[PDB]
Amino acid sequence: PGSSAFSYHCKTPDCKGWCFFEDDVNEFTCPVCFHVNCLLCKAIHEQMNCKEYQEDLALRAQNDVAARQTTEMLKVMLQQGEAMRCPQCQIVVQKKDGCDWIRCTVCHTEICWVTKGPRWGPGGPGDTSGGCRCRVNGIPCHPSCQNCH
Amino acid sequence: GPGSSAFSYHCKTPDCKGWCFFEDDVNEFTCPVCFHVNCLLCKAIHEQMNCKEYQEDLALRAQNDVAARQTTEMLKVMLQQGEAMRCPQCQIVVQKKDGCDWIRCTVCHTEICWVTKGPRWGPGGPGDTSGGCRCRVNGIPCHPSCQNCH
Ligand SMILES: [Zn+2]
Ligand SMILES: [Zn+2]
Ligand SMILES: [Zn+2]
Ligand SMILES: [Zn+2]
Ligand SMILES: [Zn+2]
Ligand SMILES: [Zn+2]
Ligand SMILES: [Zn+2]
Ligand SMILES: [Zn+2]
Ligand SMILES: [Zn+2]
Ligand SMILES: [Zn+2]
């Protein structure tokens, strides 16, 4: 039966482990089964980085109905704007409930989840030559933004 | 648990900029930009239908239209993954309302505990602890993660 709307639930089959989300935490070591869940992929991929996991998922999706299930759902989330691609390394990033800001696990770029784009310009933190420019001229990057760092 | 925050919903009118924050006791969003009523349980605009009629009509349209079937097959995935459930009383598909651990069904008005994916109460409604998740009975939450299932 899982857990709260505020929680991530472990992906080990039938595991009762769960956690809350935190802006600067992208992995969850389940205290029940001890497997490391990646919160951006919503998957356990302990032998791979996220790009390797997602490229392998697309490969398995050609001859596996359950992987094809997963990938075609991601395609719809991407189109609906529920997920996004990292603007730097282009992995698929899925939402962490209540987090307006994400640091990519693969390339470490800061992502403004509210606007579905980079937080900063190419110079990184403090570079408002690009990115969402939250609170430049006092204006939030979107009226719904509470804290995109 | 987590730092209390507000969770946004975006209007389903194509390319509309309207948006709102989710609230426990609000299941409909009247967009202030386009004035269309969004149902926050179906995540769709179905102003001439109740939610059961909308979901039944969507399943019908799935057999011939491409977009309707990717919508319905996504819901079936969401059901197995646990990002959605069926109302324990009237059995419509209920999608997660971000930041809400309690939901009052739009069709039958049954209170739903999202945390346990089931009824909040027994058959007698509020206060009936003969069924439901029994949250806070003897000071014990219905699940350690529960943030407020009323
Ligand atoms: Zn686990
Ligand atoms: Zn990952
Ligand atoms: Zn990246
Ligand atoms: Zn931002
Ligand atoms: Zn912002
Ligand atoms: Zn609108
Ligand atoms: Zn509805
Ligand atoms: Zn119902
Ligand atoms: Zn409950
Ligand atoms: Zn509860």
DSSP string, A120-132: S-TT-TT-TTSS-
The residues pairing with B39 across neighbouring beta strands, listed in sequence order, are B28, B44
- Give the C-alpha separation, B36 to B34, whole Å: 6
- Record the tokens describing residue B50, joined without a space: 């109740």
Calculate how far, in angstroms, residue B115's C-alpha sits from the geometric centre of ligand 10.
7
| CA nearest to A21, candidates A34, A37, A33, A32 | A37
Determination method here? X-ray
Which residue, chain included where needed, has tokens 């992208």? Answer: A26
Report long-range pairs for B20-26 (Cβ below 8 Å, ≥24 apart).
B21/A144, B22/B97, B22/B98, B22/B99, B22/B100, B23/B100, B24/B100, B24/B102, B24/B148, B24/B150, B25/B104
- Asked if the Cβ–Cβ distance from B2 to A18 is below 8 Å, we say no
Domain ranges in chain A are 7-38, 50-85
- Picking from B3, B96, B118, the nearest residue to A5 by CB comes out as B96
